[PDB]
Design a protein around this ligand. Structure first.
Ligand code: ICS
Ligand code: ICS
Ligand code: CA
Ligand code: CA
Ligand code: MG
Ligand code: MG
Ligand code: MG
Ligand code: MG
Ligand code: MG
Lengths: 477, 522, 522, 477
């Protein structure tokens, strides 16, 4: 499709809406233009969703409990409020970890204060204090507690900071109050910010003047990798093969001690910019730790990232960098040789959260595929600046896409593959369009690093080339 | 590393030596992990009677609940109506979770909107959200009906749904005649099943309260059927199939079986099938109304008795032999239709299957959980099979329900070692299957973590999960199954007996050790 | 010893230390057993390519066959006719085995008589046995038809069934008009499926050959359906359901679904349902005749084409998506009935399931066996699912059949690593699952011994069995299942994908070892 | 029912038959009378079955391969003829064993020469010789081969004795030809006799010249226990606790060496008289070994048997006998206390093969049950003599019962429980009569000995008292 055909498509789709929604949604849809690099000249982002239009977004509690805090493995995270939020989010996200669940690790469990109407009437602070003691009795190897506020907490005027301070001092225990009520902000995005500030305020400073830990020149932290299907582990291996020492993973497979040690590192390696740029900036401000954005999707980006990271160190790491790249060269070359011919020329539309809608484009390109549309639930304009340089000329960009819009764009553009979420998957499959979940990896992965690229390629191929897609039309119709 | 002609996902990739060594160094370097002997010590303690006693003294902490919140049930109920959009007034985070939860169980699209109330509504309320939300939803998704429920922030703020909806019509956001039934669905009261009851009663009242003057009980010669919160497609299908076979006129009020099973033929269908607005308007003219799941339809029942003047029969859920018999006999009485040869034969086929399988089922001990009506019907059928339902857990049960189940247990010798638990969660159940080990669990996918825990103690302590309930996320297409009627009983019997025989095969597969009992014929 | 409140059967009684010590003493004292190191050495050798090469050189020895003998099939065919007694001329030992084999599969009574020929008949033949046997059978069990087949001793001594039956009527042992169709069924030719074809064609001849002069093709507006040797009740039922749904007039010729599924209601019914004599007599007036299992109905086909003058369509067994489509499109053409909305929607629900499950099915490797039509349909559907049917064994298959299967494999990329084996047994198959290990086996209960063997080499080498075929003796009520049509495809897909996920759960259940991949959602 | 009523029932049932069948069946049906001990005055047995009446009997191959030879664990048994007989009999009988199947033990395997028409025409002897070599190659740890003849072998004039002699000498191997063709005899019974004679002729004399066996005064053999569900193991345990040494078990869990050592024992203990009296009499005549009948069904018979067996030995064995009885007393007393009240007064009808129709009566009586009818597929008059002693006055006796007769007797007598075979089970369950398999033990057992009695009692109870039996009648009929 030409730029004019795409712009016309936008206007046709918007015809359905009442005037106020139409005027709003027009601002959140754009056609990429190489002459225009400032996204604040072509798209609005990180605003409220329009009522009744079937946004795909979640809330601040998802962003804090589900995304940042939940993966920390040796803490207990309380879903504080009524029973729904913690139940729907229990083990939905594949933030992988090593531990003994219910004993020293708690990730896939759902701890809650199960608010009843009496807790709305009288407040939940007394219940929270009691709940903390019961946690301590029944889960003695927990290394800390977080309190992930659901909608009612702030609305009824509870004081979870006071309970956290008092019980923390009573028990010599790290107890973190998190005001991630889903009424706050407009999406998961503000939850990340709230969560980062909670780490800052209640955890990160704990070892500030503690210099027990023996540092080396090669100490780094992986910031903003939640280890989906083992993504952080297939990243870590490469960084350590290159001669670096990965002191911390924020927060996939993350322990509270490794978070507390992070102020000792020499360099913060930021994968997910959206969710963890806040604490990265904090650590630079306060501890003088530089940070840098990288990308471990596909061989092209992975190689570029390893070289850029190694350049921050000395000749010994730069040498090990080249050793790593030579080791894996035959492996990813064999993946390309097998799968690129089976995928080349095929067109993809993506819709994901805050990073992957731009970050995975290189990996598609490494298999000869073309990303013809992309967009985000909750990204900001700094994300869209980055996106416009990774995406092709005249491609479709969509912020906080509505159900209706996504469906209608797909029917016109007719992509060969869609990469999006669980609420999207079954819709597109029925239309006869190969779909891959690009949050959960469709229960596959890892997709990060060289070992991840093989799995990514296998997966795009098994789905795009599957025999089921030739069978949707009955031969008598 | 990867070998291209045999690519490894997470399992078993991370069992390669280089990954194992890397994870060991991460642990030893940076995780400040408790020593393994201490982890083993605490694990063993969590399996003890002493720990169980502490666990059962909990008052404030809930761990691994076996219930969800009201609006999820309101959404399921609303999906069963023709061209109806479920619409939850309040916070959009809730609706992402409701959709996803049902998406994972049915492996289908689940359509639902929010009106995206934000922090600003705490000053001024959610009225403008309701006006714009209804207008936008109607225009964009072209439903014929919008069925409104609430999230917990709308409830705490105290938004008046009735006034908001009336004002939306008065000010021209939607046509006056466009149907917008509503129910308040506070997550901090009851559970998802209460949300279902609330939503249903709201839709019943919308279409019938103001128009009762012209109604005559029995004048349409049909029986209304209200299914409640129901997540097996086969359950809606079997009820309609049995009534049709009997030549009984009926109206199934809330019927999502089409919208939860659209064909993959090249088009997405946002809406399919469903109870018609005309069926709800005409429902007071029925002979009577039967509630398939009465222990969560109390509010519906009061409306049907108080306004429609139907003599709702005192029937248990039609699960197992006796209760299916009772349901068919009551339908025969109301309708004046005899039970047909076809159902009499089906019944005797179920009984045949019971005689054929009774020796392997006899005395088998089960732990089980779910919603109240489902749990009580499973208990009843287990007693009919000569099984012992020793741990019966209903997190969202109440005292009157427990008494009813305790009476059923007391009427059978197979109930002598059984205890019914209410308000207890799957962390409570975990203790019970350690301290008083049963043969199997019957439950939803959250049971898998209890099976994992039991195996960790030892193979001889493992309690295998048999997946019946909601949600089932880790197996495919089990939502197509049936648990009601003779067909459902046939399916449950087959699943149980074959689970027993799978496990016996496992325990007797050991060459020259246990395979003396690895029989070809069982 | 026993503790009265927990009695132990053989497993796990004989694991008690006293029994273990007693059994060690028996072995050491008196069994002169090969040393365990030698047993281990030989076992390991039986898993090798070297052993496989010797195994596949066998010419005279057969081990663990995957077929039975003709008269078994004749019996199953005969059971499908109204008030019909199967009667096997020859030795009574055969009839005890046929009855028992089917009893164990269906968990039902199986009625069949012998005429109890003994050694004395090698002087004089079995004519008197036939005379007294028919008279006694008719008086005692009051059948409306006796369908006669033979055992191998009757075949070897050369008894002429036709003459013997004729003489029984001539001399007054049974009435002249009493129907006594017959077929020679030598166990040393073909297999059980051959017996089915022989019996059926004998019955068809009996009712039609002498009365052809008043018949007109198409005059009764129906399609005849011949199912062949079929041991799933769901398979008779689904074909009848789909044809009824389509408004197609049909006659199912040999229909044992009622007599293999009588209710347990206080009476034993020796006979139930079945194809009527009137249906067999009128069959030449049908539009055409469709064979569901053509690769064992060649004799039947020749009769229907040569005598009834029906242009039997070239259709594969209706298994999987393409072949069910083809069946329905051909039935539409013959009958003039369109394929209705209900079947089109069912088809699209199967496709939906395929799209939902394709990621777990993709590339999975299977070994499988069974009868030829069943096997080729399973292969076809596996290819449609993106699975690799790498070891395909049909003991009773032939070169022409193998060529057809090889053609289906060549047309799909998923057939590239597949081999079809004919005349090979489950001892051959055992070698293949060691040397070229697949993910699963799909087969009958005899497969359980191959799974046992694979686990003995080690857990990582175990190939789990998925039970589809005949006989299934070690699970209950699987004979109620379906494998034909869209319904059968849905059942097979669900069984395979859930077998895959059950094994993945097992391999990821290890706490702090493999449970990083023990996902709640799959 | 009175004697007069049973006699009238017999006459009423037999009215259906043609004259010849009527006159024959009348001879095979009787009513037990304490005045008449000689069964040759009241019942005929071990005759041919009448054609067309649905006998429950098997054939001589069942009696030889299925019953006697098949259980011998470390030999390979060839089902020689067409494919049916070996396939239907594969692992149908639960003759339990300890071994490594396919390596050193072969019981649940189906070895066959799978005769084709070419083998009918040219004969099977060359195929059999080739088959033996293939067996030696692929199953090198086999300790002997038997050749179990199916119907065609003798009819076509093959000479399997010649092949067995020649290949046996060539390979230094015991190869046993068994002429158990199903046309021989009238039932399983003659297969037993043929099988015993083959053991005598081809196996039992191997060690006649050998004096290396270390004998003791307490050596015995268990003769005629096929270890159904482990029956022979729960018998052996008691004999050894009593101080005896069980040199051999014929043939459940039996090895070829144990058979070869049996001529060295002091006493043969015969459980199944019908199948094994032949070889027992041979061993007395040739080796001077005495034999005695015993019964290990239920505590009354087990205790009487232990005492009678101990009385053949010295005071030391008699003393240990009393120690065994005292050890098990509280165990079986507890079984009686639990289950006798649940079963007392209930009436049973049995129909089984050659032993159990009399042998299990005492165990039923130990639980207060009454056996009101019994009968056998293939017993001889010496069996019926023993039966009339065990059975109550005026009870019904049936030899080679027809399907029709068994149904009609059951309808009139209305027993509370039926104990019979797989071909009988499903008929009587549909009639609403509790049924227990008394060949296979319905996949349960053992039933022999004190440990077997607990299981028997559990089993009769679980079936007789099961809730299913109250549900056959729809409440609307
Ligand atoms: Fe959100 S901003 Fe959201 S790289 Fe991680 S939960 Fe990216 S596991 Mo889910 S897939 Fe950066 C997210 Fe995951 S594009 Fe997605 S919405 S934190
Ligand atoms: Fe026949 S004469 Fe037949 S005590 Fe043994 S096979 Fe007795 S396992 Mo089966 S149960 Fe004596 C027999 Fe078994 S009454 Fe039965 S027919 S050999
Ligand atoms: Ca689906
Ligand atoms: Ca049955
Ligand atoms: Mg969780
Ligand atoms: Mg490289
Ligand atoms: Mg068991
Ligand atoms: Mg034990
Ligand atoms: Mg048998």
């Amino acid at each position: 499709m030409s730029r004019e055909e795409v712009e016309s498509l936008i206007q046709e789709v918007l015809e359905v809406y009442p005037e106020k929604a139409r005027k709003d949604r027009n601002k959140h849809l754009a056609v990429n233009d190489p002459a225009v690099t400032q996204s604040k000249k072509c798209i609005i982002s990180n605003k409220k969703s329009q009522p009744g239009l079937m946004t795909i977004r979640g809330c601040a509690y998802a962003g804090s409990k589900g995304v940042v805090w939940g993966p920390i493995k040796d803490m207990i995270h309380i879903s504080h409020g009524p029973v729904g939020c913690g139940q729907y989010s229990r083990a939905g996200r594949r933030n992988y970890y090593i531990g003994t669940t219910g004993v020293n690790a708690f990730v896939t469990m759902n701890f809650t204060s199960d608010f009843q109407e009496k807790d709305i009437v009288f407040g939940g602070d007394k219940k929270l204090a009691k709940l903390i003691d019961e946690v301590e009795t029944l889960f003695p190897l927990n290394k800390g507690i977080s309190v992930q506020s659901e909608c009612p907490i702030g609305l009824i005027g509870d004081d979870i900071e006071s309970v956290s301070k008092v019980k923390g001092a009573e028990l010599s225990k790290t107890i973190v109050p998190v005001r991630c009520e889903g009424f706050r902000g407009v999406s998961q995005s503000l939850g990340h910010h709230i969560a980062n500030d909670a780490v800052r305020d209640w955890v990160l400073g704990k070892r500030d003047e503690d210099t027990t830990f023996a540092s080396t020149p090669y100490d780094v932290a992986i910031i903003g990798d939640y280890n989906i299907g083992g993504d952080a582990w297939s990243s870590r291996i490469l960084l350590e093969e290159m001669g670096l020492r990965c002191v911390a993973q924020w927060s996939g497979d993350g322990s509270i001690s490794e978070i507390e040690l992070t102020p000792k590192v020499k360099l913060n390696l930021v994968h997910c910019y959206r969710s963890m740029n806040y604490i990265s900036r904090h650590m630079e401000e306060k501890y003088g730790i530089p940070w840098m954005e990288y990308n471990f999707f596909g061989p092209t980006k992975t190689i570029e990232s390893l070289r850029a990271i190694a350049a921050k160190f000395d000749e010994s790491i730069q040498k090990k960098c080249e050793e790593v790249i030579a080791k894996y060269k035959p492996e990813w070359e064999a993946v390309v040789a097998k799968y690129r011919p089976r995928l080349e020329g095929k067109r993809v539309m993506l819709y994901i959260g805050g990073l992957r809608p731009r970050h995975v484009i290189g990996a598609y390109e490494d298999l000869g595929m073309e990303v013809v549309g992309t967009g985000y639930e909750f990204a900001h304009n700094d994300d869209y600046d980055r996106t416009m340089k990774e995406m092709g000329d005249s491609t479709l960009l969509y912020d906080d896409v509505t159900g209706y819009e996504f469906e209608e764009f797909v029917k016109r553009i007719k992509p060969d593959l869609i990469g999006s979420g669980i609420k999207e998957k079954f819709i597109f499959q029925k239309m006869g369009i190969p779909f891959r979940e690009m949050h959960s990896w469709d229960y596959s992965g890892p997709y990060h690093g060289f070992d991840g690229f093989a799995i990514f390629a296998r997966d795009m191929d098994m789905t795009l080339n599957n025999p089921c897609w030739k069978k949707l039309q009955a031969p008598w119709e | 590393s990867q070998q291209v002609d045999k690519i490894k996902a997470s399992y078993p990739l991370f069992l390669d030596q280089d990954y194992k060594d890397m994870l060991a160094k991460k642990r030893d370097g940076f995780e400040e992990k408790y020593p393994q002997d201490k982890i083993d010590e605490v694990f063993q303690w969590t399996t003890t009677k002493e720990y169980q006693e502490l666990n059962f003294q909990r008052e404030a902490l809930t761990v691994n609940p076996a219930k969800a919140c009201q609006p999820l049930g309101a959404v399921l109920c609303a999906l069963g109506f023709e061209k109806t959009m479920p619409y939850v007034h309040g916070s959009q985070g809730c609706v992402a979770y409701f959709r996803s939860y049902f998406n994972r169980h049915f492996r289908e699209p689940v359509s639902c909107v929010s009106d995206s109330m934000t922090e600003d509504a705490a000053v001024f309320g959610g009225q403008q959200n309701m006006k714009d939300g209804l207008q936008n939803c109607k225009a964009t998704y072209k439903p014929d009906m919008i069925a409104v429920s609430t999230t917990c922030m709308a409830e705490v703020i105290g938004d008046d749904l009735n006034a908001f909806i009336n004002n939306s019509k008065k000010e021209g956001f939607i046509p006056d005649e466009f149907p917008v039934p509503f129910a308040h669905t506070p997550s901090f009261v009851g559970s998802h099943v209460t949300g279902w009851d609330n939503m249903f009663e709201g839709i019943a009242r919308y279409f019938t309260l103001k128009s009762m003057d012209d109604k005559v009980v029995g004048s349409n010669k049909k029986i209304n059927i209200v299914p409640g919160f129901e997540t097996y497609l086969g359950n809606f299908r079997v009820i309609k199939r049995m009534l049709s076979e009997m030549g009984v006129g009926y109206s199934l009020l809330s019927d999502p079986e089409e919208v939860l099973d659209t064909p993959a033929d090249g088009q997405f269908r946002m809406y399919a099938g469903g109870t018609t607005q005309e069926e709800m308007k005409d429902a007071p003219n029925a002979l009577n109304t039967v509630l398939l799941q009465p222990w969560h339809l109390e509010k519906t029942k009061k409306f049907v008795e108080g306004t429609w003047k139907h003599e709702v029969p005192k029937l248990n859920i039609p699960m197992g032999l006796d209760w299916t018999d009772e349901f068919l006999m009551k339908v025969s009485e109301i309708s004046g239709q005899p039970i047909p040869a076809s159902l009499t034969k089906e019944r005797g086929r179920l009984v045949d299957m019971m005689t054929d399988s009774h020796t392997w089922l006899h005395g088998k001990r089960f732990a089980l959980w779910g919603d109240p009506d489902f749990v009580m019907g499973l208990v009843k059928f287990l007693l009919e099979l000569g099984c012992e339902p020793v741990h019966i857990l209903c997190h969202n049960g109440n005292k009157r329900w427990k008494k009813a189940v305790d009476a059923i247990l007391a009427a059978s010798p197979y109930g002598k070692n059984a205890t019914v638990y209410i308000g207890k969660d799957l962390w409570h159940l975990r203790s019970l299957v350690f301290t008083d080990k049963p043969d199997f669990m019957i439950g939803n996918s959250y049971g898998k973590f209890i099976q994992r825990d039991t195996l960790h103690k030892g193979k001889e302590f493992e309690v295998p999960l048999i997946r019946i309930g909601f949600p089932i996320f880790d197996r495919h297409h089990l939502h197509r199954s049936t648990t009601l009627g003779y067909e459902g009983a046939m399916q449950i019997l087959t699943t149980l007996v074959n689970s027993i025989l799978e496990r016996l095969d496992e325990e007797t597969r050991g060459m020259q050790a246990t395979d003396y009992n690895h029989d070809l014929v069982r």
